[PDB]
Amino acid sequence: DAQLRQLVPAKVSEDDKLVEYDALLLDRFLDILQDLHGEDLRETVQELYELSAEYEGKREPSKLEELGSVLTSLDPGDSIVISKAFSHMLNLANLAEEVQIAHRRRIKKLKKGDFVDESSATTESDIEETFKRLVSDLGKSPEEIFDALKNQTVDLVLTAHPTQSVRRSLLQKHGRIRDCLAQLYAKDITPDDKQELDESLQREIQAAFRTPQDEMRAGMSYFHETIWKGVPKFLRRVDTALKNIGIDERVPYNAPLIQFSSWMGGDRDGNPRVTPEVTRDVCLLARMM
Amino acid sequence: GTVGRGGGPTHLAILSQPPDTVNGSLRVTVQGEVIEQSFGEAHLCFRTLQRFTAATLEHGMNPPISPKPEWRALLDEMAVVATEEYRSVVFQEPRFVEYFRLATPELEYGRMNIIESLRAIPWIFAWTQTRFHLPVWLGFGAAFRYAIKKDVRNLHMLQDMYKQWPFFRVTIDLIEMVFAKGDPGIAALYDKLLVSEDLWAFGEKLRANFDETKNLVLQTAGHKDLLEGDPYLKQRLRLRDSYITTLNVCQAYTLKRIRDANYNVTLRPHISKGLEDTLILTMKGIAAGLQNTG
Amino acid sequence: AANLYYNQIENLMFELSMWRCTDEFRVRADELHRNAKHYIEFWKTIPPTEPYRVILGDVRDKLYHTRERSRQLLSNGISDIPEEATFTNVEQFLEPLELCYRSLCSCGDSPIADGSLLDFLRQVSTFGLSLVRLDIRQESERHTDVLDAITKHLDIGSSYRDWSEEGRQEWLLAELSGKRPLFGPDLPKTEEISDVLDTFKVISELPSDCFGAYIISMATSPSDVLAVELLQRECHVKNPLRVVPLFEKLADLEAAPAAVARLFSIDWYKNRINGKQEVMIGYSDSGKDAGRLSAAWELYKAQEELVKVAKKYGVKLTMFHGRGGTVGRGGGPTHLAILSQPPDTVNGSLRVTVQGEVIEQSFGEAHLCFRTLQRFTAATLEHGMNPPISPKPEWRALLDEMAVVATEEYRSVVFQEPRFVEYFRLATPELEYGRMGGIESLRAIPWIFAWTQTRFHLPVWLGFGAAFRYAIKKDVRNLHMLQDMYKQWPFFRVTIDLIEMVFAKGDPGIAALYDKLLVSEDLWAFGEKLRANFDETKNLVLQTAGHKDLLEGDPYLKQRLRLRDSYITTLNVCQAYTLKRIRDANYNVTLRPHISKGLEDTLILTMKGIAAGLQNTG
Numbered sequence A: 001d002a003q004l005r006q007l008v009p010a011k012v013s014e015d016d017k018l019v020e021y022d023a024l025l026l027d028r029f030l031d032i033l034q035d036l037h038g039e040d041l042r043e044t045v046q047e048l049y050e051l052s053a054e055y056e057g058k059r060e061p062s063k064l065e066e067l068g069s070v071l072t073s074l075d076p077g078d079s080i081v082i083s084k085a086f087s088h089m090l091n092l093a094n095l096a097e098e099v100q101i102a103h104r105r106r107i108k109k110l111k112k113g114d115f116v117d118e119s120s121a122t123t124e125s126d127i128e129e130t131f132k133r134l135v136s137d138l139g140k141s142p143e144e145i146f147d148a149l150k151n152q153t154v155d156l157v158l159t160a161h162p163t164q165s166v167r168r169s170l171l172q173k174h175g176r177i178r179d180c181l182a183q184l185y186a187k188d189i190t191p192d193d194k195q196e197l198d199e200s201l202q203r204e205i206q207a208a209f210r211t212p213q214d215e216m217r218a219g220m221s222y223f224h225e226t227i228w229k230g231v232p233k234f235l236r237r238v239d240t241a242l243k244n245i246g247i248d249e250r251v252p253y254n255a256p257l258i259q260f261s262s263w264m265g266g267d268r269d270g271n272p273r274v275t276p277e278v279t280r281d282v283c284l285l286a287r288m289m
Numbered sequence B: 001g002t003v004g005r006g007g008g009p010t011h012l013a014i015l016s017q018p019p020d021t022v023n024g025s026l027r028v029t030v031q032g033e034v035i036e037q038s039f040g041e042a043h044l045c046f047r048t049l050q051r052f053t054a055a056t057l058e059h060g061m062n063p064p065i066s067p068k069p070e071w072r073a074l075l076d077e078m079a080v081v082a083t084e085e086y087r088s089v090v091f092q093e094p095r096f097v098e099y100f101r102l103a104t105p106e107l108e109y110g111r112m113n114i115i116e117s118l119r120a121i122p123w124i125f126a127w128t129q130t131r132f133h134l135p136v137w138l139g140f141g142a143a144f145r146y147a148i149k150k151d152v153r154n155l156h157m158l159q160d161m162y163k164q165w166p167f168f169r170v171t172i173d174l175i176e177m178v179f180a181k182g183d184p185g186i187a188a189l190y191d192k193l194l195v196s197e198d199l200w201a202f203g204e205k206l207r208a209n210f211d212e213t214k215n216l217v218l219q220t221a222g223h224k225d226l227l228e229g230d231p232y233l234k235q236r237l238r239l240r241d242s243y244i245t246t247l248n249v250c251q252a253y254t255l256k257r258i259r260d261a262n263y264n265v266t267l268r269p270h271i272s273k274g275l276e277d278t279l280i281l282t283m284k285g286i287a288a289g290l291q292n293t294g
Numbered sequence C: 001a002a003n004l005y006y007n008q009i010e011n012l013m014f015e016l017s018m019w020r021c022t023d024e025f026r027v028r029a030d031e032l033h034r035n036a037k038h039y040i041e042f043w044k045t046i047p048p049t050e051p052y053r054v055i056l057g058d059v060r061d062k063l064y065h066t067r068e069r070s071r072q073l074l075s076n077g078i079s080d081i082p083e084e085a086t087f088t089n090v091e092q093f094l095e096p097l098e099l100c101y102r103s104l105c106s107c108g109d110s111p112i113a114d115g116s117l118l119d120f121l122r123q124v125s126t127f128g129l130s131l132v133r134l135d136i137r138q139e140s141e142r143h144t145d146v147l148d149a150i151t152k153h154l155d156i157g158s159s160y161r162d163w164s165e166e167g168r169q170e171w172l173l174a175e176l177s178g179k180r181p182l183f184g185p186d187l188p189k190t191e192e193i194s195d196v197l198d199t200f201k202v203i204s205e206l207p208s209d210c211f212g213a214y215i216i217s218m219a220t221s222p223s224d225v226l227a228v229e230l231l232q233r234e235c236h237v238k239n240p241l242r243v244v245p246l247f248e249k250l251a252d253l254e255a256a257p258a259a260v261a262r263l264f265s266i267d268w269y270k271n272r273i274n275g276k277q278e279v280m281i282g283y284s285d286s287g288k289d290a291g292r293l294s295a296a297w298e299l300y301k302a303q304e305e306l307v308k309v310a311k312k313y314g315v316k317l318t319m320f321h322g323r324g325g326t327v328g329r330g331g332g333p334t335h336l337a338i339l340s341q342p343p344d345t346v347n348g349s350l351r352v353t354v355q356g357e358v359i360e361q362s363f364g365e366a367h368l369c370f371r372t373l374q375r376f377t378a379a380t381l382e383h384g385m386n387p388p389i390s391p392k393p394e395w396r397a398l399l400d401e402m403a404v405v406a407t408e409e410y411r412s413v414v415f416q417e418p419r420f421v422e423y424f425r426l427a428t429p430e431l432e433y434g435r436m437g438g439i440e441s442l443r444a445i446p447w448i449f450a451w452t453q454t455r456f457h458l459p460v461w462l463g464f465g466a467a468f469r470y471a472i473k474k475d476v477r478n479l480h481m482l483q484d485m486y487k488q489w490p491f492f493r494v495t496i497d498l499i500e501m502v503f504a505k506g507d508p509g510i511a512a513l514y515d516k517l518l519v520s521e522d523l524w525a526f527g528e529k530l531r532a533n534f535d536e537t538k539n540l541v542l543q544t545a546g547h548k549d550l551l552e553g554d555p556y557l558k559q560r561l562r563l564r565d566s567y568i569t570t571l572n573v574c575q576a577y578t579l580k581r582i583r584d585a586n587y588n589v590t591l592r593p594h595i596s597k598g599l600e601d602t603l604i605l606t607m608k609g610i611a612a613g614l615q616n617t618g
């Protein structure tokens, strides 16, 4: 299970659980692999994993050739299963990262008090910390901050995924995996709750494992999952930060502080598949959504 | 760009914009390979919206320092040197394109899957796949080497720039992130399997460039190791590498099995209860594993 | 100390037989006729007609009891002698002596007072009750470990080691500003952590006259100093030791002035230090990081900058010179070395390491001892009223450039050559020094020791070669500038003089012998390259000095070294072959039948003999 622990021997924060998340996900996925394709398949996948984890430990080129002698001996059908498996393991590792990042508690005494703090989420200023530095270090007034805020726009332009457009229902499966991971390590979790969260996690891992208009609909998937509700949640936080520097007004609700744009079905540069009809379609799709 | 990294690095990237280039109006591409990390999880979405909003507001009530005259002058010269080296490899080597078509899956990307004539996304994609990342770092090596030879005090000036000038710090930080996603040993494997022997010397020359450039980048950043200042990112990348390495080896041999009609393999009897489908799976998985570079 | 005073006080008694004294003195001697048991020669009952003997006889009794109480407390932890029967502070000791002094002077006997009694008063004032003040030194990281265990036990999501420098300062200053105790036996302690805290405990229980500076090795940051200040207070050191950062690496020196300025700007620390600060530099330490030339020039400049910081904040700065510098040579060369300090870096307060390999030459013979005290005292006084010339702008610029070249050459050999440590372990008795990481983790003393033994001295000269070569190539008139600097600039002249002295102790032929017998032949090309560097570096040093031969300007030292060499060479040859006989199980020798009436013992003898022969280098 561990060996991961040998890849990454130290914790990076006291609430660092990333190795544990990965060991858990890997352990359950391998059981699922065995259930679906047999113990021999599972043992081969497990062998390849050990070989490449050994490679990460010292980076001997001979370990890559051991990897190759196994991989090159696989017929096409086994090659698909193995490459699917390691792709899915990567997806699970990224879900674990997201959970870890989402719940890494802020340590204020990690801040250096300079601009390098802004290169990491562990030290960057949130919106109120930004307000407070502008007031105390730059002598800006809360009215000046409020006035600039009212007139500002952040415009985020969504572009298509260059390799994989992920459908909304897969995103939901991924969110349930994340939710199970987060709850499984909660403080006073009951044994039966934990048992049921484990069984839920196993079934969602398995469910997940098993045209320009299409690309656009896929790419519009983040609005319903997070952005639709995320935008007013953050704007409410700006209001809270405003009160805490002495501005009792909320940000006016029609101020375009945040806007979203899109290239999906509009960028025809070197892409004859983006036709005038594609453009009409994505405009109607967006309005329907 | 550095503003396209998402995560925390985007925050300083925005603040590092030249003074008065934001002025209350930020317009930024959210790259497809980054959108899941930027918006997939609700807390991360909130924090993406927050850092764009906060950095936009702060910039231009708080522009970054303007570069010292000697910093300007050194970069003006380094830019000439770096462009010359980059162009001498990418456009003026008569066999570069040939090597490019062998050493990377670029042709197989460009018949499915989504040099002056090549689009930028395939250019970045091809060298990302083989963990070599030539488009991102090529030219830094000659530039840094030139600068330290030109005047021995430029070593210390480059380090002051990295410490003091947000533009230069975020520029180096991105190179360092991409080097941490690189492995010239895996690139060498693509050469061994896919590149004719008369081009192996060329490939090895590029990898010596990779290594020298990496060390010049580390020296400018004051780091003994990659991502020394970011152990959180270093941990995340380390935990990805095993799965990506497996897909790399699989992709390299699969490409040889697809391309070379005379490459003989001994199959083992079927284990599980086209090779192109495998190639496609390795491309999607490797890209998912490496996300944003340059 | 008590024994030395006790073996001297009877001589004062014998001599001060006078009967004339002041009314105050008579009063004091009349009492003491009832508030000679223990004595060395002076056995008789002291009559009241000898008042000075009555006073001094009571001092003798206190000194005996002081000596014996310390002997018992040391030997069996316990003493039946009450502290009130002893001298526990130097004021108690000085009082009756100064009484004797003023009484004699008041009665017309000031010539007598200015004899042995004055000598004795100066001894008490010089040596106190301890002879020496003891410095305590410990690594910064060991203090960080203590504070990490303490904060981790607070269970607040993170601990001291995680925090940024600014975060650490914030926590330290809130602790220091507050009244809340830091401790309780509620603390899980490792061995090392108990050692740190028990060290402070021992300090807290002993007289404050016993101690000098608390030195922090590998110091970088204000928190390093505040951490010790906090731990001293919380371990109940009632009179805390002054805290002295030792900045070792070149990057640490570059950051030292801003670190010291931050400390001085902190109200609690400013109040704590009462207008005084000591900072330690370590020449051998910094030369191991970056090469000797670059360490020497960066140390010159770091002291310039520290003086500016000290002046801005109104603090009296004392520089503590650690081993390896020109001030550590002893003899005459030390005199110019002190005078060569940057302006205002001395300011009436010189603190210098007396290296163990130099102490015999500095103090063993009574005339040399006198002349050592004299040159330290004379040069210290002169420097404050006669600073050396400040360098010309072009000298600084050239040195700024040479330092980059020299460090690059030094580090390319010592840290970048993949097989350097391998070669180092073979060509050198370094591993055998320890028996009885790489170079970064290796201490500075073994580093210098190892190459001293083979007469190669690589740590001292490596990097001067590339630097001089670069300078001469860059502009043909730099050779004349380097020679003008040697002629006109004390800092540059003493720097080069030390290098020339070390070359005079070197022999690449002997070093080549160690290679032949001990180094894999695949590394013989490497050693040969180093020896070619040795020779080129030596000749460029000689060119800078305007010398055709080593020590051309010092025939006295040249004669001395030449007369040692034949014995040292014998020990070198013996050590090289003895190392081969110890290491290589396949090395065959034909013994001759035993001549006179383990090989490890011979190895040890050669190492001690060679070190005694070569004394100080870098």
Ligand SMILES: N[C@@H](CC(=O)O)C(=O)O
Pocket: B005, B006, B007, B009, B037, B177, B233, B290, B291, B292
């Ligand atoms: N987006 C991260 C890297 C990654 O997640 O692949 C960064 O730019 O630092």
Ligand SMILES: N[C@@H](CC(=O)O)C(=O)O
Pocket: C329, C330, C331, C333, C361, C501, C557, C613, C614, C615, C616
């Ligand atoms: N201490 C002498 C040399 C020696 O006696 O070995 C010097 O520094 O010149």
